[PDB]
Amino acid sequence: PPLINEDVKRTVDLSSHLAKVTAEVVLAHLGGGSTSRATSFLLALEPELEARLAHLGVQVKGEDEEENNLEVRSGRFFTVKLPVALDPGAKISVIVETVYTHVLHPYPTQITQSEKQFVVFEGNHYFYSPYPTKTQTMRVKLASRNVESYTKLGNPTRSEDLLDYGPFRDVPAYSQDTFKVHYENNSPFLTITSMTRVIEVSHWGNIAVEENVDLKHTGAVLKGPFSRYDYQRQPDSGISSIRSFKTILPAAAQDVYYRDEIGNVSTSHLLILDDSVEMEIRPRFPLFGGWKTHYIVGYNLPSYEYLYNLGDQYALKMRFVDHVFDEQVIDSLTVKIILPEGAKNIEIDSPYEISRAPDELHYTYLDTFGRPVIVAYKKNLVEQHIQDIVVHYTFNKVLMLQEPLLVVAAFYILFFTVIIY
């Protein structure tokens, strides 16, 4: 079924270190008859950025979302099933939204203590797709007004910080072209190298989640001497440095302990808001570039809000990856859900595909046989990836008793030994 894109108001913006581009595709069907239904729809990724895609989600104007199946038919084209089938002559506003990660490189690799980390992007003027488009005007939103070199095609006009590109009225089927912008982006370049999220469930009280976070400043690796005197007595000094970041908690965290590998960290400010618990965190030292830090954050939240129990079968729906900072990015994430002593049947409903390893056993303070753990390995997590993961497990109600009685028996055996003595 032939499809024609009519309007594509794609607007790549690079204010942060994530190059999230949204294109307001408008699809129409050709006048050709007998091709009434076109339920499917196709999408494509540029060959340069194909191995960098973060969450890519489709939409329809209004309150709706669509499912984009991943298949190979080569740039791993995404098949989108339109909610309502469209006959010839119809129009369907498809607001395709994607997010590219690790696509911004600092062109001056070794800035000194006081310079602005100029970065460089390698985009694509035309909207890469499998259908020939009509006029399409890509508007680029930048971070600062210090462009150095931007590709000129159709005389791109310049606003205060927005570069507008002229409407390309006609393009071919697989139109490709590369443009690069050399602007100044002194924004927090923070990449979480790895994160391990451990979720321990306990039927007695609450559920305690702790996460180890390795995080590293990526762009503009520091060169030359570092001087605290200049850092203190000068505001201009250390523009690229990140003094602190704020982590939104889930509004029920009771006691949150921010602790590094070496010891409890004095500096952190948490404020209990109406809908959440904000927590500003300062690392031990102000990161500049290639300065990695490792910390531990862990809070236990009441079980009644989350755990759902029906007769003998329980369910636990929770956040796969919790918020860490504004416009985060993860490079390796391992979720471990430590269920209680008995989890006979452990089915898990993942919102998206998660690589999963076999289950193993964990040995807590009173477990005699162990407790099952669920491990899930994922890479390239971003802010949009935050979703709800639900696990269904059957736990015998009386099994929880099985722990205290054993503690009694051991005590009793010692008493019996004394009697023998």
């Binding site: 040995y363 807590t364 303070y365 009173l366 477990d367 005699t368």
Partner: protein, 59 residues
């Protein structure tokens, strides 16, 4: 001494102190405190208390 068995600590060359020279920890320290703490930690582990080695070593 906790993670690695006693026999892998009685003789032990620590090449992370006195860089050019290197000091032997296996035969220069009285192994009393380390074998009373390792034993007190192993007994707890055998009883599935699973306490930390930085928490049975402070108390």
């Amino acid at each position: 001494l906790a993670e690695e068995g006693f026999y892998k600590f009685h003789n032990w060359f620590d090449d992370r102190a006195w860089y050019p020279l290197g000091r032997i920890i296996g035969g220069t320290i009285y192994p009393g405190l380390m074998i009373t703490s390792a034993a007190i930690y192993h007994v707890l582990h055998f009883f599935h208390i699973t306490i930390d080695i930085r928490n049975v070593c402070v108390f």
